[PDB]
Structure 1
Amino acid sequence: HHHHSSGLVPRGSHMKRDYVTTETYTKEEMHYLVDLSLKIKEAIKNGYYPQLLKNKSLGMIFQQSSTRTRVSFETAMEQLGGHGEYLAPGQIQLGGHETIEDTSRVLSRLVDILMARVERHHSIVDLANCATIPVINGMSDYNHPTQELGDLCTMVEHLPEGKKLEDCKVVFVGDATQVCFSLGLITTKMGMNFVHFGPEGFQLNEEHQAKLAKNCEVSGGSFLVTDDASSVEGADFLYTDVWYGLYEAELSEEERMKVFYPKYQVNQEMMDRAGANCKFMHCLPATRGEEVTDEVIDGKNSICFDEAENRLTSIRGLLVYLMNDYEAKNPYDLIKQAEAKKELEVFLDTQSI
């Protein structure tokens, strides 16, 4: 161990940068990312595939399979001229008998950048701390930062009418999942008005609100209540996730229904209560009938699928940022490069067995 302290963020490096949570990024930095991500989107949307990552190898570590997340990366890489390497849940070990210190050190010699969908957050940062190459947090038990950004992009693309974002209201209904926390962590970052409404039992905790509070002391934001049918009012965006528990204390079936199926379900009535043109968001996958009725999710005001596409939109740009940044800081000697190339040419042109 470092014998220090370290909780939830990684030690920074002077020569590389990670993406473990948005707590390490400023409002302006996130703005940069959204613009970059979106400029790239518009290029690819129109047939130009920016080869910003030619020949670069990304290692993907999953401890819990996630198709949406996997294909998003695997694809983002291809479009930009690179490759995504899938180390299936078992394929890897991460902490199986070989210390993360070891795994991190050797992975740094074999790929150009790292992403990991880890079970316990602690180990995603352990990885970010011990690797010499950029590390991205696919999602932990704590937050989902690659989603915070996908959703930021989505909201930007959908402001309706001279609301400037800083004055939009984003409301999250249901369980305090990491998706939930992340949404608050990002909206407050951007100086918006956030609110998590949800059952006395399943609200974001004081230790979490502590972080949200800190955010607004800097941006001009806000948060929270418990009494539904009132905090949804005037919402510009209504966001929900699923009711299952914590992939360990989960699936009580009719027990989920017990706690949430009074209110907490996003139906047309709930939608209307919020606003005439309140757009609906869901990180998917959605159990239709539970946290949201079909008429809403398949409705004219649903953007959950644009949002879905934007999961890629944002990882596309996030990869570019981290790599570009890594190259400054670690820039190639154009001379050494030129010689290395000639040396190789000559060898190939002249030697054989």
Structure 2
Amino acid sequence: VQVPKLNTKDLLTLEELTQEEIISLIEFAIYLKKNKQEPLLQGKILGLIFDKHSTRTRVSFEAGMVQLGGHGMFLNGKEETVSDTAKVLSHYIDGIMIRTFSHADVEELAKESSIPVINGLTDDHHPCQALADLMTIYEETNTFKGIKLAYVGDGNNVCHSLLLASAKVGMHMTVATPVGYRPNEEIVKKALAIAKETGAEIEILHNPELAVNEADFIYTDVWGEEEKYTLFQPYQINKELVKHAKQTYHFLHCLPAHREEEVTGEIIDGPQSIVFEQAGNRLHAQKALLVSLFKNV
């Protein structure tokens, strides 16, 4: 097996990876997906820490380790500080995947931990998703040079992670969100700065027709309610809006979905959709990531 050397212990936002690093990861995920499960992490253990329990993440991670000959250790966020607990894990274990709300907390755990820490999802960031998404796209295009991804919806953590992800690999990305719901300046900013070096064109705006125009890929996600709903109704993915993209676009969604909200069934269940392939690749992307991180011994 030709395992990738990452020059980082942790993976938190996506930004601690070089561009080459990200491809190597992707290319490796794909090789693993094709190849019969190697016990590359014999007896290694991944701690799994949760704020609110999240199935999709937990299972995809635990699965991966198990398939790599490892073990996943389910811990809870019913806790001594998140410093003390980092110290401890390190003695007895090989890595940690945390999902919690405050990203600052994760950063802290990483500094203090002496084993790899992986952000399962914080409020601000969701690297692993984006990484599975890039994998999915690359499976289709075999390249990011010259590719447009439109994301329309709420300016959320998966949005952030896509921005950084696209910037890193020189994939162009435009975002359309309603007036209130733009993503964070600080991130947009970082993303733009990465892009200066990869020639990726990143943009944020409001009219979605503009985002989707000539896009190779469209991505949405789920959204007191009375007034909000009426504001996002125009940001729905449908026969009508998707006509402005390329004939040959594919649809992405991180799931789960509420049909006839963010996306019409016609689209999500149509042949343009590849949400399922996407879903699967969570497993594999992560596996690739895990193995690289764990061989920095």
Which interval holds the TM-score relative to the shorter structure?
over 0.9
Query: CA deviation digits over 1:278-317, x for unaligned, max 9?
Result: 1000011111111001111001000111111011111111
Structure 1 runs, 4 residues or longer, greater than 4 Å off: none
Asked if the contact 1:180/1:241 (under 8 Å) is kept, the reply is: no
What is the total number of aligned residue pairs between the two structures?
Answer: 290
Could you tell me how far apart the structure 1 residues matched to 2:156 and 2:105 are?
19
Residues 250-269 of structure 1: pairs in structure 2 closer than 5 A = 252-261=224-233, 263-269=234-240
In 1, the alpha carbon distance for the partners of 2:167 and 2:87 equals: 35
1:104 Cα deviation after fit: 0.7
Q: Say which of 274, 281, 292 aligns to 1:303.
A: 274
Structure showing greater radius of gyration is: 1
**Residue in structure 2 matched with residue 278 of structure 1 by the alignment:** 249
SS in 2 for 1:184: helix
Q: How does 1:65-76 map to 2 (within 5 A)?
A: 65-76=53-64
Aligned partners of 1:16 and 1:133 also within 8 Å:
no
Within the alignment, does 1:219 sit opposite 2:219 as a pair?
Answer: no
Unaligned 5+ runs, structure 2: 1-6
1:217 alignment partner AA: K
Q: Which moved more, 1:223-232 or 1:276-285?
A: 223-232
Equivalent position of 1:136 in the other structure: 118
- 1:1-353 to 2 correspondences below 5 Å: 17-43=9-35, 48-90=36-78, 93=79, 98-159=80-141, 164-222=143-201, 223-243=203-223, 252-261=224-233, 263-325=234-296, 327=297
**Contact kept? 1:61, 1:89, Cα under 8 Å:** yes
RMSD: 1.4
Deviation for aligned residue 1:16: 6.6
Whether the aligned pair in 2 keeps the contact of 1:146 and 1:315 (CA below 8 Å) is: yes
Q: Residues 231 and 16 of structure 1: is their aligned pair in 2 closer, same or farther, counting only changes over 3 Å?
A: closer
The percentage of counterpart residues that share the same residue type is 42
Q: Which amino acid aligns with 1:82?
A: G
TM-score (norm 2): 0.94
The 3-state SS of whatever aligns with 2:175 is: strand
Residues in 2 aligned to 1:20 and 1:116: alpha-carbon distance in whole angstroms: 10
Q: In structure 2, what is the Cα distance between the partners aligned to 1:214 and 1:295?
A: 38
The Cα offsets for residues 24-46 of structure 1, whole Å up to 9 and x where unpaired, read as 11101111111111111110xxx
Matched to 1:104, the amino acid is: A
Structure 1: gaps (5+ residues): 1-14, 244-251, 328-353
**Contact 2:152–2:211 under 8 Å retained in 1:** no
